[PDB]
Amino acid sequence: CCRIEGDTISQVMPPLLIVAFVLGALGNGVALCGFCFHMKTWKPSTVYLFNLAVADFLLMICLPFRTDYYLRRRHWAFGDIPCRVGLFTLAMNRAGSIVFLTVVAADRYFKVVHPHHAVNTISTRVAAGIVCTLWALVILGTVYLLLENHLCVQETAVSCESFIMESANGWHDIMFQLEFFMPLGIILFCSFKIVWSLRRRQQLARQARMKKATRFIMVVAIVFITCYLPSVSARLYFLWTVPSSACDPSVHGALHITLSFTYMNSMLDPLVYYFSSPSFP
Amino acid sequence: SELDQLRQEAEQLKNQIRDARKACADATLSQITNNIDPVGRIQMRTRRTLRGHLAKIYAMHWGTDSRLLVSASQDGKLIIWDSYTTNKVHAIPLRSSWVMTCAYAPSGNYVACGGLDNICSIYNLKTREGNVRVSRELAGHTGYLSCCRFLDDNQIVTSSGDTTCALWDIETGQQTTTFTGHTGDVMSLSLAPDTRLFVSGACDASAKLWDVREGMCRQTFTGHESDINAICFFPNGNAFATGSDDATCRLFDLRADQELMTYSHDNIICGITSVSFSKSGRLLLAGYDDFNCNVWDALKADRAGVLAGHDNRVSCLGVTDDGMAVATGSWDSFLKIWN
Amino acid sequence: NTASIAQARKLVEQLKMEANIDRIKVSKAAADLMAYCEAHAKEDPLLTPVPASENPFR
Amino acid sequence: DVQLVESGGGLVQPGGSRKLSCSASGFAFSSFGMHWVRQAPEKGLEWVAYISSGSGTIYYADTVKGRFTISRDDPKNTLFLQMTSLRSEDTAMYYCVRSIYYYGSSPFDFWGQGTTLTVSSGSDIVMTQATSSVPVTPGESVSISCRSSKSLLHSNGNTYLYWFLQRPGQSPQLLIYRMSNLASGVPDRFSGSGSGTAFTLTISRLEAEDVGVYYCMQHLEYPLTFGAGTKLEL
Amino acid sequence: CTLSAEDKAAVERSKMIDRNLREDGEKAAREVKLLLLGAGESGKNTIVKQMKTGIVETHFTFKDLHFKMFDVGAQRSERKKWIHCFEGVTAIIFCVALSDYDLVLAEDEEMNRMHASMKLFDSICNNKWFTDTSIILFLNKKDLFEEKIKKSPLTICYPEYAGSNTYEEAAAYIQCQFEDLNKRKDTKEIYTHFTCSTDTKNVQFVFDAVTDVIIKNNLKDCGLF
Secondary structure, rough: OOOOOOHHHHHHHHHHHHHHHHHHHHHHHHHHHHHHHOOOOOOOOHHHHHHHHHHHHHHHHHHHHHHHHHHHHOOOOOOOOHHHHHHHHHHHHHHHHHHHHHHHHHHHHHHHOOOHHHHHOOOOOHHHHHHHHHHHHHHHHHHHHOOOOOOOEOOEEEEEEEOOOOOOOHHHHHHHOOOHHHHHHHHHHHHHHHHHHHHHHHHHOOOOOHHHHHHHHHHHHHHHHHHHHHHHHHHHHHHHHHOOOEEEOOHHHHHHOOOOHHHHHHHHHHHHHHHOOOOOO | OOOHHHHHHHHHHHHHHHHHHHHHEEEHEEEEEEEEOOOOOOOOOOEEEEEOOOOOEEEEEEEOOOOOEEEEOOEEEEEEEOOOEEEEEEEEEEOOOOOEEEEEEEEEEEEEEEEOOEEEEEEOOOOOOOEEEEEEOOOOOOOOOOEEEEOOOOEEEOOOOOOOEEEEEOOOOOOEEEOOOOOOOOOEEEEEOOOOOEEEEOOEEEEEEEEEEOEEEEEEEEOOOOOOOEEEEOOOOOOOEEEEEEEEEEEEEEEOOEEEEEEOOOOOOOEEEEEEEOOOOEEEEEOOOOOOEEEEEEEOOOEEEEEEOOOOOOOEEOOOOOOOEEEEEOOOEEEEEEO | OOOOOHHHHHHHHHHHHOOOOOOOHHHHHHHHHHHHHHOOOOOOOOOOOOOOOOOOOO | OOOOEEEEEOOOOOOOOOOEEEEEEEEEEOOOEEEEEEEEEOOEEEEEEEEEEEHHHHHEEOOOOEEEEEEEEOOOOOOEEOOOOHHHHHHHEEEEEOOOOOOOOOOOOEEEEOEEEEEEEOOOOOOOOOOEEEEEEOOOEEEEOOOOOOEOOOOOOEEEEEEEEEOOOOOOOOEEOOOOOOOOOOOOOOOEEEOOOEEEEOOOOOOHHHHOEEEEEOOOOOOEOOOOOOEEEE | OOOOOOHHHHHHHHHHHHHHHHHHHHHHOOOEEEEEEEEEOOOOOHHHHHOOOOOEEEEEEEEOOOEEEEEOOOEEEEEHOHHHOOOOOOOOEEEEOOHHHHOEOOOOOOOHHHHHHHHHHHHHHHHHOOOOOEEEEEEEEEHHHHHHHHOHHHHHOOOOOOOOHHHHHHHHHHHHHHHOOOOOOOOOEEEEEOOOOOOHHHHHHHHHHHHHHHHHHHHHHHOOO
């Protein structure tokens, strides 16, 4: 339990998170309506993209309260239960966004590098089973936030945070790190094989369409890395300098600011997954 | 040269026919019908949606009990529908999946179909074994078989793409009567209510009235500018309506031997796949390529209503024998019942 | 190319029988179709919708 | 031709277990629902069990439910009736019955010859026939009347009344399948009529070929119940 | 609910029929539909026996992939009345003989078989139903054409041709003339293969073209395309 006074934080978080929330909400609203209203029949790939949009949208809904937390000089004026559900929503929808980025990437890997596999024939039944099971394990992995306490008070300075206090947190940090590395490995491998295959087939690659498709296959990994690597980086820097950087103001501000890039990633996802595709309505 | 003399005689005969048509026409159907009340706006709602086909539905036919249906699609499946309950009575796997026509027997005992295999296959619905088996396969057409219509359990007239209509004997499987005279491929077919005559629309922009028991053309009806794809008698059997690719439906009379009224609109430019009449004949229902069916005032050439709700081209139409419902089939693998 | 003479004879014979057809006036045929439409107008469920109790597709 | 051959019957000690087989030939066994109907030596038809096409629906009589087991194996066209804990009231000649169900179908149309099994020593629709045995002169019209406790007329317009004729030393055959509909292969001199709970079956110009016991069966709801049976003599 | 026993059993029969229809549709969705086209009896039969009267069904399996190849030969009618039946085929296999550049069709006076093939290819390729359907063009009888081009020049067929009378240059010129008939180069691909009377790798070429078409379809599903 510490008393950080990162003013700068209160001068950058409010408008940053306001912009992230409004833009991501507009994008995901349109994307979800498009997926559920206009796309006449669904295919497994559509199911995955739709689940990704759902995860990002739930990140968007539970933002404005955290915005206020940041407006009130980091003071959560909503009691204990709402902050336990707020952290649960944030963490669960972060892990869902990552899982439904990895599944989209692996589905693309099978649709390109192995187009004649039975895995491309499975109907929306097994796709729905997969996505339901994925949410089930994400929920079972992030429910511990919901069956414990995180709120802390220091002289009427009500503080509520998970990734930025200090601990090994019962392997919560190792889940964090394997929550950005293994999807990174899968995404990079899948994109490398996809691009390499589409380049190999020179009768098809010369089209504009296969050029844009590969450009976006690389853009998605670029955006993922540039959005998730700052928070991971700051957290590992805090971990390795825990004695020296115990409750450091610059480090705490760094962690708070860098976790704002994941929300921006979920904002960006419709622009690179739904609006980018010229077939989706 | 005898050939040039016979061409001159044919031109003289055509001019005589045209002059006899012109001198016999005094007041059109519009000039007599404009003084009666219009039908208003005819609005129909999709009462049933028959799902189960997975390719473009190319044809349909209603039962004489006005409840049982048959539909053909490029799946290679003839599905028999209970339209009241949306129940599949039968699913008939076809030897050739390129089916473009299907008919249902008036007794309800048989179903015919045909297509690119040039064969009309008769299916016995009510067998002792409890399955639908091929009664026989009627072969002899050298072109794609575009329409078939049952006269009874043993007689069937089949339209085909070899510029030839044909009447078959299902007991022997033999070519009983061959109807020739069309220049283009015959695309549609319609039997008279008494099954004494029938009309056929072909790709020579012409319609011909044949007699079943003499096997030779009585009258030839012209006026269309493109390929006739649909034809249907008026319910008394003294008139019929056609549908072609020039976005016009024409109504022809057998006794007057003339075109009476064109059912066309400026906003309709796509072709017509199916043409069907209501029970009284007051409403003419035509299925078009712009994905919807337009109900026409058959006496006034007014768009009485639009049957929209198909995502692809409406390929086949059918009104029940009691006039209760109209069923539209389309290329989006769906059948819809309307009232 | 002498086989086209038989086809021409068949065509002019078909046109000759098609010309010798008794034709009623188009006003009479129009009145006949109008009378058939008016006589069966009440028994047309598509033209005159029946109540939902009498509608089998309700 | 369509044929159903039963096997497995015989003398059984009480409390024993026996399995009945019904080999099907001449028809698409998979597309037919299949019934077991037994007839005690007291000359009364009683429905036992039913299995639908695809084995998705199975019904039993209340006197055999949980004690009999009906199953089918469509690859070899065999219908099974696994019977356990056989008691003396199970002594009957079991008929394997063929029935299909769609719009306009004729269920209970074909019955098998039957296998004889001998055992040593409330809410149901009651189907009533007033006359159990009446004499008739050949060539003259006769009427067999049947009554039901519940109305067999459904909301869809079908009156689920079935008429069966069982000649002496023969399996029952279907005559009328829904209160008016003449079956296949039976003469037009058989006519059925009625409404609600009152039913009648008229046989104009009777011949010695029509001598037998006439049963009325309901198919409105399971269990399917038969009449007592009206026998025509002389 | 408000159903009789026979109504419920008919509903069960309808559900079984729906199940079998779904299985048949899933079986037919994994099959590859190919439309076989060509100007008369030029090279269709040799191609058919290399993989393997209305429409002819040819079934062959290559690398665990079932192929449905349809021959619309001897369907002498208007093509536009039934060519929309093949709108959903995977690819069009177009067979063109290379040796009929100097032969006459004999149905019309001063008519070239080669130019008839060009006109049929122009009608099929630029058809409204085949806007996004790829064409696997096969140039049949390359050895016969190679041995007869020395006796008969190609300039009797193409008056504007000014290249050498060699097999490679004139064959490439014929392939370029056939590919020039594609007015939809931004939305469809034409695969050209030169096949001899007894050439074994014809199926592999068809499999590669079909795999490229299937990849193009797969992308659309992910929306990526």
